[PDB]
RNA sequence: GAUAAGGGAAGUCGGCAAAAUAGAUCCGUAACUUCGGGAUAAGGAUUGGCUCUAAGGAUCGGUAACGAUCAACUUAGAACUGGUACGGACAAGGGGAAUCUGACUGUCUAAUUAAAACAUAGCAUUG
RNA sequence: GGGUAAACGGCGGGAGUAACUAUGACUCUCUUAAGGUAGCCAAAUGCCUCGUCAUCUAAUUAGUGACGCGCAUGAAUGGAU
RNA sequence: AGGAUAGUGGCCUACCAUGGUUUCAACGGGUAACGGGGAAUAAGGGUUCGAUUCCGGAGAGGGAGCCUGAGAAACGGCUACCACAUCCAAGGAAGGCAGCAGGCGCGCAAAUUACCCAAUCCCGACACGGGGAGGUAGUGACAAUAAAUAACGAUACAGGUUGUAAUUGGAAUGAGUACAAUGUAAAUACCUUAACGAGGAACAAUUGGAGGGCAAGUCUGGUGCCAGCAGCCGCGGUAAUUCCAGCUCCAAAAGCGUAUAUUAAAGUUGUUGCAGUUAAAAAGCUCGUAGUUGAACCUUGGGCUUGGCUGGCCGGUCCUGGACCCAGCCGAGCCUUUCCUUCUGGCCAGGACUUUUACUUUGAAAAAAUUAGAGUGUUCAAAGCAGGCCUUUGCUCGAAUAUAUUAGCAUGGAAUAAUAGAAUAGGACGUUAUGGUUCUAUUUUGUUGGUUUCUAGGACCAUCGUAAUGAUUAAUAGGGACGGUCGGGGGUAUCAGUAUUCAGUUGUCAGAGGUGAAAUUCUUGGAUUUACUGAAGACUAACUACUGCGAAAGCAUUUACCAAGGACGUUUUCAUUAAUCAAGAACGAAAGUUAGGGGAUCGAAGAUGAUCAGAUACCGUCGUAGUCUUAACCAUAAACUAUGCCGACUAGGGAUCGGUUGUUGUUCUUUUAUUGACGCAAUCGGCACCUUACGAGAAAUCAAAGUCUUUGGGUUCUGGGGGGAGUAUGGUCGCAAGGCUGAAACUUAAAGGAAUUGACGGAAG
RNA sequence: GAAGCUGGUCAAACUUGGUCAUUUAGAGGAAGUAAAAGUCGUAACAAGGUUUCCGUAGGUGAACCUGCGGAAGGAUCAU
RNA sequence: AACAUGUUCUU
């Protein structure tokens, strides 16, 4: 494991064998949707709503309680952003390390990182265009990706 | 990467053989370790195993009685006509009278025997003794 | 596991790589660079004629003490200029200078044989006749 | 100031003097190199006259992709034609392979020496 | 009494020695402030000298490439390119 | 669009567009390259060869252009040039053997200027003519088949019923010469045969060997590390089983040896099937495109009816025969929510539609010759495709069969591996749903030609209605977020520390320094030493470890700031996004290069004192570059774990670093919590270690270097005896130094690895 | 209806220049290999008498020496 | 502190 990296870490989550919602749970699935839409509203990308859920309102997983994931149902309200959440966080990333690097010439560490984190996010978009998320012609660049994060 | 479950299977099951343990853990599972295990315990050469769910791509355990030798894939599933079972038969069996070619055909997953019996051809899959 | 690909649809890459590999075995690779055709002294053929150009008696390597009586030859063919050596005790005396000597190789394939420095040849006859019968004297050298 | 059969530097200290080349279009261009050059390297072809063909615009007027009117000289091609001529006068590089030497552009012995001499940027030293 | 050469400048002789011969990697000895290093050459610097070898020619005191105990080459009196 | 062609076509022309091929290797270069059927070797997989008996192509000295003709860009046709070359009375004329035979040349390398149309077939006006095509002879140890060089008896011998060492005889025979026929176009030869044709049956067998590999001598002379042999190891220096010779023996024998090439041996090219810690060989390190390869999941079970052929029970036996039971195999059909196209005529035959592939089955067809193989006394056999029969005026079985299949064609199957589908529904069905808009077609009231709504059949739009309306897990794959952490990971400022050198201020006085011992050197102009104070550059002691971090190179004073990171935790999120990677990129100790700055200390070069036979060395004293920093370069190390990366599994043990989770006879806040440290247990990750050796290995050793002849999880790179040589050359990068790529001639029998016993050590005890 | 004439078309061949490939002469220079008993030293193998070796940079008759960084394949698996 | 060297070829 570790795409760009040699640790063997086997950290995750177990999800629950059983995929019904608990006897203590009695919130109904409009209460947990308009929930996910009011919090999507107010600014929280998907997992971010799914860790409030899961703190504050007992609600386990979204699949089990309405019977969708949360970017699906968010898809379905017309909140789902335009590009999606993991290749924007590493578009994000990689903005702040060539703010630094153009900061911080002699960080040789750092352009080495940086090299590592764009391909990665040239690795993830394509994936998102070989399945339609993304358009045929999207294409990662780093003069224009701080209009993106902005 | 994982790149073959049945190859990780059936390796299990020879160091278990190995080493006299009676028993063996298998994971993931698939349709074809089950069909492969299903036509090694027909001729004897395993116990009875048990699936277990996991709402997942599964795990099983396998019961062992010592009459196993060795059982192994052959990776690539070369393409075999007929004509060409004996070649694989005499390169890979301890002699005529025993062992088993284990192929993949359009009729299903069989040994070559059957295969031979029903006049049918496909990939080779496996082998057991 | 091996370090060979193993796919089904590998063959160019195993293909190829056993044609590189095989410019390390010494005679696939004489036989495709055309060697013994373009080098060697006799071209590719195995028996080639001659002119004696003078006689020379080579020192034997250690552990042995002897002079080796061997001649200095230039071929019809191409002109080249080979050291060829004489057998059987007695038959320096059998070829002289711009006399027609018939070579071979020594067995060896282009190598030196026994103690011999430097020499890969041998001569078979001399002035048309076998250096075999000159030596037995079932027949003498025509002049 | 011109021309000269055949030869073509045999002349001479020495090709001195003269000759040869030359515009433009198209083609093609080596070693070496400080990569900028060398380069018009070298080396080839074309060029007249006439009769045509095509392209390249402006201003008005509502699929105007159109009409009307106007207007400049460039470019490319074809037919024909002559004592095979034609950058027809004029104007207008000869080229190549090397050695010595000074890097280069620049400067001086007005009135016998323009150079390899002086200067130069670069480099170093001194107060 | 000390320093200083991109200050002026300077930068060695005599003998012997290898299993053909020749040559001398090697040795002995005298001697300087230091004994000419890297390079380069019969060069605009070599007397002997039209040096010797090669090339160029029918024929070359010319040219060019080599060689170098160099009368008297040689490192910012700058060396070699 | 034309022209030209027999005709398609950039085949050519005019105008127009800017396209076509390529890392799945285009284009270019080499070929000691005509392709194929085939050949040699062959456990299997392979390797090598194919000019040449058949098929296809091409050429007629080189090039080109044509005539004639159905057909030629023909060469035993023409025309021209080039090159060769014949004659000539000098004006001219005539040529093409890679047809047959023959000459010259070339070379290691290959045959007669013979006879004939009798067979095979071909051509022509042709029953008849012609055929160096073809057939027959000559030369012919290319290869292949069969196969003489002898045999039988007796004497005394020899010996334990014959197997016996010699010389005594009777015979037999074809090698060859030759009456005759045959054979044949005529011959020759074979086959058949008068007269001939063997005791040393001289009608006389050879080629290589006798140390080992490898079968067969330590016999006699010669030589004396010479001459010679010897594939390899070796023999030979005066007792040579190896040379030179004589005798004996061995092997194969009408054949045996040598040279070269190739095949097996070679698992020493490795797909099957090699090796890479130390023998040759893991890229310094990551990123990354092509290539290769990638988790699991969707009709599973159950029942009924029934065909065949397998064994025995009937047994029914003449090896074999029928209904019944038993089981076994290959099959079909129905039913289970049910796949398996759909209509017409009415289990076939004409319509309307079909998600694409790989793989496997079966078949059509696939030249003979060759291969494998059935039949045949060519007297055998190699071969050939014949031959056998009461002996005829005839009769007769034959001229088998498989092998071929990469590609194409047809076909059964639906495992394996892909591909498509309904997500802003633009989705599926409505058979005889409903309405609207278009088309076409048979049919008239038969007289021609008509109207255009019903109507038959496509195609669309709208409404409505059926429906269980439609989205697989979330991988102890991967990515992302989130939380508290942890690091001598990186960068920029900043702040310590003593020490070193130097400078000032003092103080005393005779040496100091340095070494194995000294000398160079510094010193009464005060050295060294002592105290106080200052200035510069480096460096970061002790703490400091079988400890941490980073891709590797590397990284160690404080504080602050900047951006990253692993692991852990997580009932958060996305859903295959991945692994390894030619090309291509980032970084890369030290030294080295360029330009500024700094230059305490050590210190290549250099200077100098010793030592020494000499030391331009080690040791002493100085000291330039360098050492440091900022901008650029350079790209290499024993860049090492001499050990590629990802993934799974296989055995015991105690420690340790990071995170998290449960738990004290402990010390401490504070008397106690949510203080902290420590102690006890679990767990994930990491740096390691100890034992074992099931297993691996040549061993040393190895928890991987195991799960490897019981040989296949994915994938990249590298090696193929030692040298020449990481050299030369071409290319490329670099300011240079150099880096990267990278041969060949030639040479050589070992080089090398790990271990053992000894010996030796200016090693230890 | 012959010779001949015009313009095309295919185009041998010759000259010049260019380029590609393959052989090959050459003063002199610099290597490699081979070859019983020539010279000079003694670098390596033992702590080989300065442990050896790698990269880099200078120096030197020759092996080689020295500086900086690295390795143990060390002469230390250890206080 | 110093300590360099050992013709060729075997049996
Ligand atoms: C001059 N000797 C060469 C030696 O250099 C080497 O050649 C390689 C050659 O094998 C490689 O190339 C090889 O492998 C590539 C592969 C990448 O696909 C193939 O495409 C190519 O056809 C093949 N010849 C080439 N890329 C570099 C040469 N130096 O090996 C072959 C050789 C003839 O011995
Ligand atoms: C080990 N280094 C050696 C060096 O010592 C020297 O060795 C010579 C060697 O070459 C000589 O030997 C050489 O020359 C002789 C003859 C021609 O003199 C030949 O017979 C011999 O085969 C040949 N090797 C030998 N006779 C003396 C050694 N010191 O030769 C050069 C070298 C290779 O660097």
Redesign the interface.
Not at chain 2, 75 to 78: A, G
């Given at each position: 494991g570790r795409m760009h990296s040699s640790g063997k870490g086997i950290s995750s989550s177990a999800l629950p064998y059983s995929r019904n919602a608990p006897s203590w749970f009695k919130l109904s699935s409009d209460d947990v949707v308009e929930q996910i839409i009011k919090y999507a509203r107010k600014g929280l990308t998907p997992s971010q709503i799914g860790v409030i859920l899961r703190d504050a309102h007992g609600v386990s997983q979204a699949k089990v309680v309405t019977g969708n994931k949360i970017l699906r149902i968010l898809k379905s309200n017309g909140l789902a952003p335009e590009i999606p959440e993991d290749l924007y966080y590493l578009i994000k990333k990689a903005v702040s390390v060539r703010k630094h690097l153009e900061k911080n010439r002699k960080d040789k560490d750092s352009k080495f990182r940086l090299i590592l984190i764009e391909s990665r996010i040239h690795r993830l978009a394509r994936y998102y265009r070989t399945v339609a998320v993304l358009p045929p012609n999207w294409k990662y660049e780093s003069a224009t990706a701080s209009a993106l994060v902005a | 990467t994982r790149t073959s479950v049945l190859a990780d299977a059936l390796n299990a099951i020879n160091n278990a053989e190995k080493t006299g343990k009676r028993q063996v853990l298998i994971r993931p599972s698939s349709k074809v370790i089950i069909k492969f295990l299903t036509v090694m315990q027909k001729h004897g050469y395993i116990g009875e195993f048990e699936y277990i769910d996991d709402h997942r791509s599964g795990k099983i355990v396998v019961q062992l009685n010592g009459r196993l030798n060795k059982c192994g894939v052959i990776?690539?599933?070369?393409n075999v006509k007929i004509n060409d079972i004996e070649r694989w038969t005499d390169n890979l069996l301890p002699a005529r009278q025993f062992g088993y070619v284990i192929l993949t055909t359009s009729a299903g997953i069989m040994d070559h025997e059957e295969a031979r019996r029903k006049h049918v051809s496909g990939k080779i899959l496996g082998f057991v003794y | 596991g091996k370090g060979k690909p193993?796919?089904?649809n590998s063959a160019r890459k195993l293909r190829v790589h056993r044609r590189n590999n095989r410019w390390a075995d010494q005679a696939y690779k004489a036989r495709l660079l055309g060697t013994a055709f373009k080098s060697s002294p006799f071209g590719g053929s195995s028996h080639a004629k001659g002119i004696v150009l003078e006689k020379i008696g080579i020192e034997s390597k250690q552990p042995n003490s002897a002079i080796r009586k061997c001649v200095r030859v230039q071929l019809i063919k191409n002109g080249k200029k080979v050291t060829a050596f004489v057998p059987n005790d007695g038959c320096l005396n059998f070829v002289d200078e711009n006399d027609e000597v018939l070579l071979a190789g020594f067995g060896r394939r282009g190598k030196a044989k026994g103690d011999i420095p430097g020499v890969r040849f041998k001569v078979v006859k001399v002035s048309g006749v076998s250096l075999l019968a000159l030596w037995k004297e079932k027949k003498e050298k025509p002049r």
């Open positions: - | 990776q690539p599933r070369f | 193993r796919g089904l």
